[PDB]
Design a protein around this ligand. Structure first.
Ligand SMILES: [K+]
Ligand SMILES: [K+]
Ligand SMILES: [K+]
Ligand SMILES: [K+]
Ligand SMILES: [K+]
Ligand SMILES: [K+]
Ligand SMILES: [K+]
Ligand SMILES: [K+]
Ligand SMILES: [K+]
Ligand SMILES: [K+]
Ligand SMILES: [K+]
Ligand SMILES: [K+]
Ligand SMILES: [K+]
Ligand SMILES: [K+]
Ligand SMILES: [K+]
Ligand SMILES: [K+]
Ligand SMILES: [K+]
Ligand SMILES: [K+]
Ligand SMILES: [K+]
Ligand SMILES: [K+]
Ligand SMILES: [K+]
Ligand SMILES: [K+]
Ligand SMILES: [K+]
Ligand SMILES: [K+]
Ligand SMILES: [Mg+2]
Ligand SMILES: [Mg+2]
Ligand SMILES: [Mg+2]
Ligand SMILES: [Mg+2]
Ligand SMILES: [Mg+2]
Ligand SMILES: [Mg+2]
Ligand SMILES: [Mg+2]
Ligand SMILES: [Mg+2]
Ligand SMILES: [Mg+2]
Ligand SMILES: [Mg+2]
Ligand SMILES: [Mg+2]
Ligand SMILES: [Mg+2]
Ligand SMILES: [Mg+2]
Ligand SMILES: [Mg+2]
Ligand SMILES: [Mg+2]
Ligand SMILES: [Mg+2]
Ligand SMILES: [Mg+2]
Ligand SMILES: [Mg+2]
Ligand SMILES: [Mg+2]
Ligand SMILES: [Mg+2]
Ligand SMILES: [Mg+2]
Ligand SMILES: [Mg+2]
Ligand SMILES: [Mg+2]
Ligand SMILES: [Mg+2]
Ligand SMILES: [Mg+2]
Ligand SMILES: [Mg+2]
Ligand SMILES: [Mg+2]
Ligand SMILES: [Mg+2]
Ligand SMILES: [Mg+2]
Ligand SMILES: [Mg+2]
Ligand SMILES: [Mg+2]
Ligand SMILES: [Mg+2]
Ligand SMILES: [Mg+2]
Ligand SMILES: [Mg+2]
Ligand SMILES: [Mg+2]
Ligand SMILES: [Mg+2]
Ligand SMILES: [Mg+2]
Ligand SMILES: [Mg+2]
Ligand SMILES: [Mg+2]
Ligand SMILES: [Mg+2]
Ligand SMILES: [Mg+2]
Ligand SMILES: [Mg+2]
Ligand SMILES: [Mg+2]
Ligand SMILES: [Mg+2]
Ligand SMILES: [Mg+2]
Ligand SMILES: [Mg+2]
Ligand SMILES: [Mg+2]
Ligand SMILES: [Mg+2]
Ligand SMILES: [Mg+2]
Ligand SMILES: [Mg+2]
Ligand SMILES: [Mg+2]
Ligand SMILES: [Mg+2]
Ligand SMILES: [Mg+2]
Ligand SMILES: [Mg+2]
Ligand SMILES: [Mg+2]
Ligand SMILES: [Mg+2]
Ligand SMILES: [Mg+2]
Ligand SMILES: [Mg+2]
Ligand SMILES: [Mg+2]
Ligand SMILES: [Mg+2]
Lengths: 6, 209, 118, 112, 56, 122
RNA sequence: AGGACCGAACCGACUAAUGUUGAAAAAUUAGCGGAUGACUUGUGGCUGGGGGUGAAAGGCCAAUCAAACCGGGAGAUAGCU
RNA sequence: AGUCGAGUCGGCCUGCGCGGAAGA
RNA sequence: ACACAGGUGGUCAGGUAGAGAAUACCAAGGCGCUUGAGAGAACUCGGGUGAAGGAACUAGGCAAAAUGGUGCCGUAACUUC
RNA sequence: AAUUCCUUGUCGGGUAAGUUCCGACCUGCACGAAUGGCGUAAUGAUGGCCAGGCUGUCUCCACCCGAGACUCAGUGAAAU
RNA sequence: CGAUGUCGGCUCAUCACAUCCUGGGGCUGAAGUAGGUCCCAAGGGUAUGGCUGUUCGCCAUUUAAAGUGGUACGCGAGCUGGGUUUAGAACGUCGUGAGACAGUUCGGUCCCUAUCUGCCGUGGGCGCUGGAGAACUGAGGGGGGCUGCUCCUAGUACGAGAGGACCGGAGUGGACGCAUCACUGGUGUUCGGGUUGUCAUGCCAAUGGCACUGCCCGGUAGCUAAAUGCGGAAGAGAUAAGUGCUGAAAGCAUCUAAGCACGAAACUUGCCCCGAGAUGAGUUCUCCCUGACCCUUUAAGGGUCCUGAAGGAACGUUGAAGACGACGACGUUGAUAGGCCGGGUGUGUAAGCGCAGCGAUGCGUUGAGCUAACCGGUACUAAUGAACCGUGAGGCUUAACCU
């Protein structure tokens, strides 16, 4: 998963 | 007053005539032999040391033996102290018997609890388990979070974690005396007390009135 | 916890332990002295000594019980004909364990277990 | 254990009759309402016996006003006044828990 | 998961302060054959407590 | 040992056939009701023209349990099913006029003296 | 009879657990779908990079794909680090 | 202020304090 | 990339049970998987059993439990029959 | 409504209690007729909802069997 | 921005007090019951469900109460992945179109073996001034602290009635915690039995292997909860808000300035546990060692020979002790373990033989046989004579005592 995702 | 040192024989019941079954721990209390009297002058507090039972003559060391020789008692399996209240007086060599408890309604019983070894937080602290299923990955009985974040950035002392459980001094307070049998050196107390069969128990009159 | 429990697991399941001790019991009766690991030797006493005790009283039922536990008629016949009478007036303690150092391959503590009269 | 054996044996009843799982048994039990002490009978099939000295017990199953009831009696309890075998049952097991799934004609035990 | 700083040779030595082996306190001597052995174990020549056992 | 969601049979002629416990009353996080405990119930099944109807919410007293009840000598009495007697929600008094099947001496109190009086046994 | 039915081989890959410096750069275990067909498979052949091929997902084209790989223009250019 | 026997009352300007003042 | 739990087309096809090339146990034949020995803590993994309750769990019955064969009886709405 | 923002619309059903579901209303923010409309038996490892059965999913965990974990001997990594 | 994983849930919390409950008070438009409002108080306690990704909220039903906040919207190197937040697809809508939408919809990989700090446990070293074995003192630290209902007081006080107390007492519960296994039970692949398929032991009979322990039924010890004992306190001290007594300043008044009293789950104790590394290293009791020499830098000096205590460790047999260490028992002058003997318990009437039956089977011998971890016993086996470590009377100064 994306850190500080959009 | 003082108490006495006894051995946990095991549990049984006493059926009363009126139908009730009373669960009892049977405590063998052989004579407690006074081995030393601590005085306020020489020791700074008032107490008796007692021994009970018997030790193998070959397994009692020279230091131990000389201490018993001064008392003029046979070696017992250990030494225990009981603080004397104001007015209580005992002499060295005096045997104190279970008859001490003849008019005692309730006792506190101290012993060493059974040893569970290294216990998890579920058993040791009654932590709730996490989901058996619903996706849990390798975290069924594990403790969960152990703190907050950057503040305070450490785990607090006394945090409940896995560790050695049992095998420690425990006191159960205010157990009814069901029977004192001087002839058989028995004290029957109502309900369970700490420790395995065969283990030493200190029995004192109940501190709560 | 294992409070008051008996029996060694020996990193095997129950069916393997049973089979292993049946074999090992036969080996001891046949040869009268074997070398094995020390924990296996200690467990083997709990298997072999009852067989010898059983073999003190020769009956068809006892031959068959022995046969059920050994599955070897050479061994059953050697109990009953040989060992049972040899230990007729001996109240247990048919075996002796002698410690004998460590095994080269894995440093396992080893022992000889022998029948006492051997 | 010797100590406990002596404490236990001195409380044990001497009069307990031989009975056996599958026997029909009538147990007479003391009941109290205030200061009035009746004897109440409980008749049924013995489905289980625990032989354990002073701690011996036995379980009796009865169908009672259209409802299955089991009582576990503590054999040496003074509450149990009397035990009497009305009928000797022929079963093979020690415990007849299979009777819990059986009613009526399915639940019958041959006499011994 | 992993160190932020290489531990020192000092810290390495301190961790290994419990790694030293222990020599056997003393060997026993058989009453008959005269030979040294671990206490409670048979000798290399197959004696134990004076009597010949094994025989190999 | 009755808890929320437990289904009980009905030991009376209130007309309810099958009720479900929705609360063990008389304590915060109280887990279980045994014999003699009041529970809150919902009627899941009722007979066509009885005193109560499906979906009614009211009280009941538990009178038989499969877990059963211990007596002071260590004896136990267990029943083959869990059953209760419906009570009026405000005045905890039985709705029915007959009790079916045995009850226990645990109901021997003022509140449930009517149940004891009507029960065919104990 | 059948893109018919249940179900092994065979072909797949729906769910969960494990694994995640793996036994494995996509698997294992337990279940799961198809199983005479628009099926599946061996051997060989043909289509070539703005090109192929695609029951279409920008899928696939040698563990690489919104333009393969290798060599070359080549020390591209880089007001950026 | 509650015969009594000496101060008393209330505003102003100023110095220093008091309350108002609860947080992980 | 490995003495790698993966991948790889064809042929052969014993016995008892079984519809069977399924499955169980065996034959012929082949193997025990190139670290072992102890111990019997937490916790993890893979399993077994569970009082009373029975979806109250949860985003969601996920997982588990359950059902399961043959013969015969019997089988609703709806329907493109 | 795979479309409805306001919105958990309103009414009915189901539940003790239902922002989901089913039926209905029409105030369609912003359906609609082959970039098809409405319906439809059968079919689906398709989405949503309800029951029976079933259960360690849970109340609330307990015990047990195995493989690791732990100790000994041999070999002997890694990210940083 | 050469990455500080981002909502909610779960697990685990910890603090604040602006207090939800329980405790103490003042005012009341406080008769009582019940409220309102403000002050003190953080000891402990403070629901489960339906709906929704939800936080929240609404609803059902409880409760003494269902507090409000901080802790990276506490907590993904602890779990989840519903939502949000990639790539597929569709709807509405916008756009000629590619596409677009804190609009919706179905689907959509959550890694890390812990070095350091921390924390939970558990050892080793040295120290504590001769060595050793014990028993303690208690500086200090931690745990615990919740509360309902019923009855009595009393249908009393209060009230027109309706209703309905304080204060004090007794009982019995909920939740939580500690212990325990006598009971009730679970488990019990180490006990007994039933039974399917098949293979084997030559065959019959009897057995064993494999099939999830093949499938099952029971069940011993142990562990254990749903089982059953016990706990929260009373009391004391000093107080909060508050209420006073005496009392001037200020002829009065005034709880305050001097002085004196009362006053709460908070505080200090009382209860339980740890505890002398309490380096401020404490105390008490007992035990042990009472030899000579040599040299140099002549000093709390270093060697040599003789000596080797009390005790310890080691090894072994082990344990209701245990990851390993540790801790406990025991080592022949011995019940430490195993075996063995007797018993118990469990299973449920073995095998063989006989009888009955055509036979499956049934019956007798027979409550038989077998029976783990249990109980009581018993030297049969294994716990060895030794060896090892640890020494040889223990610094200086001063004081009081050798009177
Ligand atoms: K997962
Ligand atoms: K190209
Ligand atoms: K260039
Ligand atoms: K629309
Ligand atoms: K078109
Ligand atoms: K059409
Ligand atoms: K950034
Ligand atoms: K008030
Ligand atoms: K508080
Ligand atoms: K909080
Ligand atoms: K953050
Ligand atoms: K999260
Ligand atoms: K982190
Ligand atoms: K993790
Ligand atoms: K969005
Ligand atoms: K650090
Ligand atoms: K028990
Ligand atoms: K048990
Ligand atoms: K067989
Ligand atoms: K000290
Ligand atoms: K320890
Ligand atoms: K027979
Ligand atoms: K027989
Ligand atoms: K028997
Ligand atoms: Mg233990
Ligand atoms: Mg939970
Ligand atoms: Mg994973
Ligand atoms: Mg898991
Ligand atoms: Mg800091
Ligand atoms: Mg033992
Ligand atoms: Mg191993
Ligand atoms: Mg098997
Ligand atoms: Mg090391
Ligand atoms: Mg087909
Ligand atoms: Mg494919
Ligand atoms: Mg598969
Ligand atoms: Mg199909
Ligand atoms: Mg098929
Ligand atoms: Mg696309
Ligand atoms: Mg590719
Ligand atoms: Mg290009
Ligand atoms: Mg150029
Ligand atoms: Mg360049
Ligand atoms: Mg100010
Ligand atoms: Mg290999
Ligand atoms: Mg193939
Ligand atoms: Mg096969
Ligand atoms: Mg294990
Ligand atoms: Mg299961
Ligand atoms: Mg269950
Ligand atoms: Mg059940
Ligand atoms: Mg739910
Ligand atoms: Mg929930
Ligand atoms: Mg499923
Ligand atoms: Mg299943
Ligand atoms: Mg909406
Ligand atoms: Mg509605
Ligand atoms: Mg529902
Ligand atoms: Mg609709
Ligand atoms: Mg359209
Ligand atoms: Mg048109
Ligand atoms: Mg269409
Ligand atoms: Mg190693
Ligand atoms: Mg960085
Ligand atoms: Mg305040
Ligand atoms: Mg405080
Ligand atoms: Mg956060
Ligand atoms: Mg993770
Ligand atoms: Mg984190
Ligand atoms: Mg998602
Ligand atoms: Mg949403
Ligand atoms: Mg967006
Ligand atoms: Mg929009
Ligand atoms: Mg405290
Ligand atoms: Mg017991
Ligand atoms: Mg049982
Ligand atoms: Mg079983
Ligand atoms: Mg045969
Ligand atoms: Mg085989
Ligand atoms: Mg096989
Ligand atoms: Mg005055
Ligand atoms: Mg022995
Ligand atoms: Mg018996
Ligand atoms: Mg048999």
């Amino acid at each position: 998963k994306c850190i500080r995702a959009p | 007053m003082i108490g006495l040192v006894g051995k946990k024989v095991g549990m049984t019941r006493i059926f009363t005539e009126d139908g009730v079954s009373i669960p009892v721990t049977v405590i063998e209390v052989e004579a407690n032999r006074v081995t030393q009297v601590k005085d306020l002058a020489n020791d700074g507090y008032r107490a008796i040391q007692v021994t009970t039972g018997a030790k193998k003559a070959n397994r009692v060391t020279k230091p131990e033996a000389g201490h018993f020789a001064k008392a003029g008692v046979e070696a017992g399996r250990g030494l225990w102290e009981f603080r004397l209240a104001e007015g209580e007086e005992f002499t060295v060599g005096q045997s104190i018997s279970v008859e001490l408890f003849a008019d005692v309604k309730k006792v506190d019983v101290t012993g060493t609890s059974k040893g569970k070894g290294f216990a998890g937080t579920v058993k040791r602290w009654n932590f709730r388990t996490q989901d058996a299923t619903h996706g849990n990955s390798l975290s069924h009985r594990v403790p969960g979070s152990i703190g907050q974040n950057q503040t305070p950035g450490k785990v607090f002392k006394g945090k409940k974690m896995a560790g050695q459980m049992g095998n420690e001094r425990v006191t159960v307070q205010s157990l009814d005396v069901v029977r004192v049998d001087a002839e058989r050196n028995l004290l029957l107390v109502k309900g369970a007390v700490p420790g395995a069969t065969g283990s030493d128990l200190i029995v004192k009159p109940a501190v709560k009135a | 916890m294992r409070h008051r429990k008996s029996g060694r697991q020996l990193n095997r399941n129950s069916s393997h332990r049973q089979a292993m001790f049946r074999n090992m019991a036969g080996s001891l009766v046949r040869h009268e002295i074997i070398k094995t690991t020390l924990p296996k030797a200690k467990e083997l006493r709990r298997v072999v000594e009852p067989l010898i005790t059983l073999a003190k009283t020769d009956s068809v039922a006892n031959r068959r019980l022995a046969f059920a536990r050994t599955r070897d008629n050479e061994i059953v016949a050697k109990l009953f004909n040989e060992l049972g009478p040899r230990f007729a007036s001996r109240a247990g303690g048919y075996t002796r364990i002698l410690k004998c150092g460590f095994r080269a391959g894995d440093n396992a503590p080893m022992a000889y277990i022998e029948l006492v009269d051997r | 254990s010797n100590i406990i054996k002596q404490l236990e044996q001195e409380q044990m009843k001497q009069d307990v009759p031989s009975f056996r799982p599958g026997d029909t048994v009538e147990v007479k039990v003391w009941v109290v309402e205030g200061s009035k002490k009746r004897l109440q009978a409980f008749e049924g099939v013995v489905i289980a016996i625990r032989n354990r000295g002073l701690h011996s017990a036995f379980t009796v199953r009865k169908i009672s006003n259209g409802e299955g009831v089991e009582r576990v009696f503590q054999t040496h309890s003074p509450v149990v006044d009397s035990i009497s075998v009305k009928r000797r049952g022929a079963v093979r097991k020690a415990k007849l828990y299979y009777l819990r799934e059986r009613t009526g004609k399915a639940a019958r035990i041959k006499e011994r | 998961a992993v160190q932020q700083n290489k531990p020192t040779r000092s810290k390495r030595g301190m961790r290994r302060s419990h790694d030293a082996l222990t020599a056997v306190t003393s060997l026993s001597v058989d009453k008959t054959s005269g030979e040294k052995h671990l206490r409670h174990h048979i000798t290399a020549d197959g004696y134990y407590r004076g009597r010949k056992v094994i025989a190999k | 040992m009755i808890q929320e969601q437990t289904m009980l049979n009905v030991a009376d002629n209130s007309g309810a056939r099958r009720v479900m416990c929705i609360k063990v009353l008389g304590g915060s996080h109280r887990r279980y009701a045994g014999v003699g405990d009041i529970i809150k119930i919902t009627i899941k099944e009722a007979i066509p023209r009885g005193k109560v109807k499906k979906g009614d919410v009211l009280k009941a007293v538990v009178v038989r349990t499969k877990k059963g009840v211990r007596r002071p000598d260590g004896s136990v009495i267990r029943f083959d099913g869990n059953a209760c007697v419906l009570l009026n929600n405000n005045s905890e008094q039985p709705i029915g006029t007959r009790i079916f099947g045995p009850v226990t001496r645990e109901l021997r109190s003022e509140k449930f003296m009517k149940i004891i009086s009507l029960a065919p046994e104990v």
